Ligand binder design. Structure first.
Ligand code: YB
Ligand code: YB
Ligand code: ZN
Length: 607
């Protein structure tokens, strides 16, 4: 039972295939067309079924060439409205039928962002992009919006001829629209069964550049060159991921660099990973985000969480694989450095929510909780920490990677729970059950706060970061003159970011210290989004008024939630910038991503 879905569960019926025929109307801000669902009954004498929908307009439902009765239930907040369809003929178990639903989306669809030409790099054409994870596919089309159901799909998308449509599928040709010569139809095929949160669409003035044997990078023309360089390690990361997880089954691995309002660092849409342009640091330093999306091709897209309560299965294993990819490219001391950094991010999340907060539990009960509200670093970092702890307990990385590959093989094309994962772990490690029985399972999986055990981390690369952060924290006014640009000479960008994260954990620092840090290190000149984000938070929390315009600009010129949300929160918490923070949000709200707008609104207590 998926408590986030209002549709018939997988035990009643299952969608096997979706054939989508739609048209993108930029003037009306709507997607209109037909969703033809091939549904298999799992029960005898099946006479009706229920689908998830959210702000959809339904024109008609057609089965066997005739219109059928349907009814929309009362809206259940963020879950949308259930749509019950009356079947014309009762179905036997395993019988399949095709249900063709004619629909139209709302311009306020929570799955979509519509951009005017002014909001794009090129300034001549509009742009549209989707983001279905977790439960926004129901705001695009009627479906069993649950990851417990996997389906293949085909799609034909009509767009204005000057634009390009792309999807989470293999490109299957393009033709002029026969019904309209000012339009083009783009075709797509997804032959591997996927959960519907993996359905994705982009429409815009897109250009491509090849960067590997199975990879194109896509973006507006202005970002193509920078993107091709930034993500050049993609093929090398795919090869390592295949060695760790087994064959890459998806055919293509393309990357799409979205406009700055994209709310995540990356989204693992199959065949077409979506990424934020905030990765464009100019030195490939933020490539771990690509390693993470690549890893989801196994942990998440092949082996999927049965419900959102088990989201840590997708995230924890992906972060574990991501850190191994970067470890293979840059060494074991670097994997430990990132693992230790992740523990710090977990300390921060637990401090923010509070140690008894239910959102700090690894497995969360999402009945009546919007998954967008519950989203945090917890499933990523507490999930990673559990696997890293198990790796150490069980004999090391080579042994634990053997389990990860067997786990992917066992559960490929399926949707599983925490209990399915735990049972297989016990089965694989049957000769080490005495070791497994020492794990405090109740605490790790179901208790709030920090986990009961902290793993062992090599500190080689972290030492210089801690040492410099401690010099600044313990410094008095008479020590400020001892700091100089030479303090940073032997630090990588990763180490500079970690020095800032360590210092930010002890913020505020005195205003004189922050001013000195700018005087000697010129952090205001750094373009790297992660470093700039932590530096600005440190400035604002330390009450530097000069940083207010810089923090407001970063919070609005991009929309990656990881940055926008804490920047707005820090600005609202500083008396000097409070009013500016609220006004800026109110002015930008109408042109923000709908999910980001809702979350920033809640964080600021502005309705
Ligand atoms: Yb074809
Ligand atoms: Yb002193
Ligand atoms: Zn992820």
């Amino acid at each position: 039972v998926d408590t986030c879905s209002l549709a018939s569960p997988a035990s009643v019926c299952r969608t096997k295939h979706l054939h989508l025929r739609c048209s993108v109307d930029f003037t009306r801000r709507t997607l209109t067309g037909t969703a033809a669902l091939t549904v298999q009954s799992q029960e005898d004498n099946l006479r009706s079924l229920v689908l998830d929908t959210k702000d959809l307009t339904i024109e008609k439902v057609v089965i066997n060439g005739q219109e059928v009765k349907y009814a929309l239930g009362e809206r259940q907040s963020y879950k949308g409205s259930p749509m019950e369809i009356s079947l014309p003929i009762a179905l036997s178990k395993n019988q399949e039928i095709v249900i063709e639903i004619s629909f139209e989306t709302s311009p306020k669809s929570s799955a979509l962002q519509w951009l005017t030409p002014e909001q794009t790099s090129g300034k001549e054409h509009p742009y549209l992009f989707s983001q279905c994870q977790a439960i926004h596919c129901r705001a695009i089309l009627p479906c069993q919006d649950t990851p417990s159901v996997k389906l293949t799909y085909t799609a034909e998308v009509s767009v204005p001829k000057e634009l390009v449509a792309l999807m989470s599928a293999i490109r299957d040709g393009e033709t002029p629209d026969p019904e309209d010569p000012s339009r083009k139809i783009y075709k797509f095929i997804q032959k591997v069964p996927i959960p519907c949160y993996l359905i994705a669409l982009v429409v815009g003035a897109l250009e491509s550049r090849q960067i590997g044997p199975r990879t194109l990078v896509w973006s507006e023309k202005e970002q193509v060159e920078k993107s091709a360089y930034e993500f050049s390690e993609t093929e090398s990361m795919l090869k390592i991921a295949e060695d760790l997880g087994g064959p890459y089954v998806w055919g293509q691995y393309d990357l799409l660099v979205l406009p700055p309002s994209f709310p995540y660092g990356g989204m693992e849409n199959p065949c077409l990973t979506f990424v934020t342009p905030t990765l464009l640091a100019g030195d490939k330093s933020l490539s771990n985000v690509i390693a993470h999306q690549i890893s989801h091709s196994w942990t998440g897209n092949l082996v999927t969480n049965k419900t959102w309560d088990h989201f840590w299965l997708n995230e924890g294993h992906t972060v574990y694989l991501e850190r191994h990819i970067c470890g293979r490219l840059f060494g074991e001391k670097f994997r430990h450095f990132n693992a230790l950094g992740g523990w710090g991010e977990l300390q921060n999340s637990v401090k923010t929510f509070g140690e008894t907060h239910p959102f700090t539990k690894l497995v969360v009960d999402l009945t009546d909780i919007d998954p967008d509200v519950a989203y945090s670093s917890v499933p990523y970092e507490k999930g990673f920490a559990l696997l890293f702890y198990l790796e150490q307990l069980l004999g090391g990385p080579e042994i634990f990677l053997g389990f990860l590959k067997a786990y992917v093989e066992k559960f490929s094309y399926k949707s599983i729970t925490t209990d399915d994962w735990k049972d297989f772990l016990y089965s694989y490690f049957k000769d080490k059950v005495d070791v497994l029985n020492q794990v405090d399972w109740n605490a790790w999986l179901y208790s709030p706060g920090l986990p009961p055990i902290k793993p062992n981390y090599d500190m080689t690369l972290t030492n210089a970061c801690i040492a410099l952060s401690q010099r600044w924290i313990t410094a008095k006014e008479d020590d400020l003159n001892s700091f100089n640009a030479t303090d940073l000479k032997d630090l990588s960008s990763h180490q500079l970011n970690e020095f800032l994260a360590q210092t930010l954990q002890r913020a505020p620092l005195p205003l004189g210290h922050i001013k000195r840090m700018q005087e000697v290190y010129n952090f205001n000149a750094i373009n790297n989004s992660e470093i700039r984000f932590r530096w600005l938070r440190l400035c604002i929390q330390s009450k530097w008024e000069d940083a207010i315009p810089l923090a407001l600009k970063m919070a609005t010129e991009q929309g990656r939630m990881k940055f926008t949300r804490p920047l707005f929160k820090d600005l609202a918490a500083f008396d000097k910038s409070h009013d500016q923070a609220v006004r800026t949000y109110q002015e930008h709200k109408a042109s923000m991503h709908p999910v980001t707008a809702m979350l920033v609104g809640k964080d600021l207590k502005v309705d």
